[PDB]
Amino acid sequence: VHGSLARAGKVRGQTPKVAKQEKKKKKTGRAKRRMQYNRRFVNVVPTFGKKKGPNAN
Amino acid sequence: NDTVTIRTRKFMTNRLLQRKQMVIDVLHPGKATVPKTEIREKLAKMYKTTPDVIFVFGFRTHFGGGKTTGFGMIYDSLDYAKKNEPKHRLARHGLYEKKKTSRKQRKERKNRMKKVRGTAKANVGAGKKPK
Amino acid sequence: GKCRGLRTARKLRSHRRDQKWHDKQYKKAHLGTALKANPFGGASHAKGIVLEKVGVEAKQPNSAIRKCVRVQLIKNGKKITAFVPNDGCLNFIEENDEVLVAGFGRKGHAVGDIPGVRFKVVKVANVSLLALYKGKKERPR
Amino acid sequence: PVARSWVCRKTYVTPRRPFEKSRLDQELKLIGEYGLRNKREVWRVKFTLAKIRKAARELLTLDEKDPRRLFEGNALLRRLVRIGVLDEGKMKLDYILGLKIEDFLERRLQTQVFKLGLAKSIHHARVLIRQRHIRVRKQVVNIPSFIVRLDSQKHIDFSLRSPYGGGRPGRVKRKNAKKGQGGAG
RNA sequence: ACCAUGGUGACCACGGGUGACGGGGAAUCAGGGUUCGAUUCCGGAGAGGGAGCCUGAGAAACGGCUACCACAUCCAAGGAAGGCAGCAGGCGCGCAAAUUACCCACUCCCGACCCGGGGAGGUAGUGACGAAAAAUAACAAUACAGGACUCUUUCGAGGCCCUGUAAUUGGAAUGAGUCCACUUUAAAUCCUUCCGCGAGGAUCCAUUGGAGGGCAAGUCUGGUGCCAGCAGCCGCGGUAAUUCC
């Protein structure tokens, strides 16, 4: 119903909690300024798509 | 013994202080910082004097090795060297017995002699045996 | 029209010194009664104890019950309200605690849609409120 | 009360607005080309390039045969010739305003040790500075943003303590040798 | 004391408020300004609140005295002792602020004085108030994908450049850590010099926020169903949410 003062913490305490699974550690610092500069400017790929953004699906 | 250079620069004597003071740098290829007990004789075998007047200190070493540098001096007389010299640099190599009570206890003895007034034997023995 | 001449600056400096009162910011920061009006009194954070969890419904285009508490400060202990800006965190706070309150964000006015709120909740019982929200401290013994 | 210095100012400054695409990405192709650690040391050198052009805009509205133009201007002009950004004969007050930010990232130690071929792969030329190898004439320096001058531009080589300049190897040879004469002769 | 009846004022006196010590300055910056400056420099004021004095060249002194007010100690009940807005520390107010550490060796000061004193001052410990530098792998060999480089050709990969998957290794690479020895200092520790150590999921492992718009980045999957919530604003949410978890 209208949720007067009960169910504070209704949607967090019922949504499924998935284990944050481990990955490669991310390269930081000067390496992060290396590994994304190569992804954006030196590899201007001849593919089309009207400048498809970096987080595509 | 093998490869150490002891240059000097900016030497000025003064018979005011009766000392012979200069800047010393110590250039070594790849070894450690050589101690004073190896350097204060290397002027003694070059200024031909006794190494109980040569006082070296202040050796601060650059970034990257090679030249460390510092200050040094030579008194004229060991009799002079114990007159016009402060006792801290004079006792870095053994020439003086400096260990009294730590000052925080000597402060409290002076204020305790101050609260027992006038009696001379209780301005000495104001609690020597009660310890 | 305006009053110009090379001897007039008394007229300009006396016409100015009342006409600066009529905006909000010079009147709320220099008359002094708006320094008594906020419960903080020259501050940004001031502790207080929790009286009762009391909920308010949000304003017109929404419909939800925003959750609030009923803090009473220790310095100049007048009653306020305080919003707990978090999902489950009405259950992390409990009765008769000590909390910290801050501003709600835009200088003594409510943000979003809570009708008549002025303060938000940080650090219940000297442990951080978001650190109970992630799992970085627990409530003491 | 104290005898401390107290005089410490900031060296960079934040930009005017954030998040505009013709600012950060035209400056992203400088953080990646000359291989710098982060963008804090780009706002450093742009503010370094700014304050010279802050001085240089006063020196253009100062008239000719001016005391404080010719004194300050020549003294400025004899300071950026020796830093290598400006050549000798065409030293002027006018050619300093057309200067760009590229010509102070070139004059670091980190890429003047690359173009002398002492190391390849410009991100590696950061490392062999910081990794205690590469010297100014008698002074080895692990600082990548050393602004190398022009008199002392020819004496960059390996240090005489360096693995690539001397000997006395580190652990990685001495540990690989130890496993061969540790289970055998 | 005797006389004179005057003085100040809308050019803002008088009265009150000041969360006002005054200044040199700080932030800010087209120019005009705006706001703070309790604070390390100089000038003033006050050592619980008012008041009164002795001695001194110098005091209305409080690490001098006595009175009153208020707070407060010892006590055998007779009387004593007081005053941290000095340095360390406590309590209390508080969103809210350093160790009951070492030394006079350094900058100076006083004296009867080359000799003594110094919580002045310096050395440390806390310190993500802050400011200045700067780690968190680069190098590689296939290898995965592109290259104006190739045959008299969109023959096909490649004698050559950059990148990621994903390797196998490596060696005159290396610090932080562990720890000698010098060194610094009053004796130390710092930090620099230097042995010895010290890195294959370099496990010695980067966090704070955001992803509709302002505004750089997801209409990817799930849960939810105007509930929970998000959001500085505009908004989003009511069974397929690019905004909540």
C-alpha dihedral, B115 to B117 to B121 to B127, nearest 10°: -10
- Report the alpha-carbon distance of residue B113 to residue D38 in Å, rounded: 66
Residues in a beta bridge with D157: D135
End-to-end CA distance of chain D: 68
The answer as to whether D146 is a domain residue is yes
- Report the alpha-carbon distance of residue C59 to residue A47 in Å, rounded: 49
End-to-end CA distance of chain A: 38
List strand residue ranges (DSSP E) for B42-130, in order.
54-61, 67-75
The one-letter code for the residue type at B59 is: F
In sequence order, the 6+-apart residues with CB closer than 8 A to the CB of A40 are A54, D25, D28
The one-letter code for the residue type at B96 is: Y
Q: Is C65 on the interface with A (CB under 8 A)?
A: yes
Note the resolution in Å, 1 decimal.
3.9
- Report the alpha-carbon distance of residue D29 to residue D36 in Å, rounded: 11
How would you class D98 by CB atoms within 10 Å of its CB: exposed for 0-12, middle for 13-18, buried for 19 or more? exposed
The answer as to whether D10 is a domain residue is no
Cβ atoms of C80 and C71 within 8 Å: the answer is yes
| Segments forming the whole domain that contains residue D131 | 18-185
Cβ atoms of B21 and B11 within 8 Å: the answer is yes
- Report the alpha-carbon distance of residue C97 to residue C71 in Å, rounded: 10
The answer as to whether D11 is a domain residue is no
Residue C56 parent element (H or E): strand C54-57
Neighbour subunits, A (≥3 Cβ pairs < 8 A): C, D
Can you read off the two tokens belonging to residue B36?
């004073």
Q: Is B30 helix (H, G, I), strand (E, B) or coil?
A: coil
The answer as to whether D99 is a domain residue is yes
- Report the alpha-carbon distance of residue B37 to residue B51 in Å, rounded: 10
* Closest CB to A40 among D28, D35, D123: D28
Residues in a beta bridge with D136: D139
Q: Is D135 helix (H, G, I), strand (E, B) or coil?
A: strand
Report the residue count for chain C. 141
- Report the alpha-carbon distance of residue B83 to residue B79 in Å, rounded: 7
Chains D and C touch (3+ CB pairs under 8 A): no
Cβ atoms of D158 and D139 within 8 Å: the answer is no
Tracing tokens 């009923």 back to the chain, one arrives at: C70
User: Which ranges in A1-57 belong to alpha helices (H)?
Assistant: 30-35, 37
Cβ atoms of D44 and D30 within 8 Å: the answer is no
Query: In the structure, how far is the CA atom of residue C13 from the C1' atom of nucleotide E33, in angstroms?
Result: 15
The answer as to whether D2 is a domain residue is no
- D79: closest CA among D154, D155, D153, D150? D150
Q: Is B63 on the interface with D (CB under 8 A)?
A: yes
Q: What are the boundaries of each domain within chain C?
A: 1-141
> What is the chain D residue with the closest CA to A36?
D32
C-alpha dihedral, C36 to C37 to C43 to C47, nearest 10°: 110
Cβ atoms of C48 and C75 within 8 Å: the answer is no
Cβ atoms of C116 and C59 within 8 Å: the answer is no
- Report the alpha-carbon distance of residue B97 to residue B25 in Å, rounded: 30
> How many beta-carbon pairs below 8 A join chains A and D?
28
Laid out side by side, the sheet with C119-122 consists of C54-57, C65-69, C82-83, C119-122, C99-103, C46-49, C72-73
* Closest CB to B64 among D140, D166, D168: D140
Query: Phi first, then psi: what are they for D89, rounded to 5°?
Result: -70, -40
Tracing tokens 């954030």 back to the chain, one arrives at: D18
- What letters, b where the CB count within 10 A reaches 16 and e where it falls short, cover C29-44? eeeeeeeeebbbeeee
- Report the alpha-carbon distance of residue A12 to residue C89 in Å, rounded: 11
Number of domains in chain D: 1
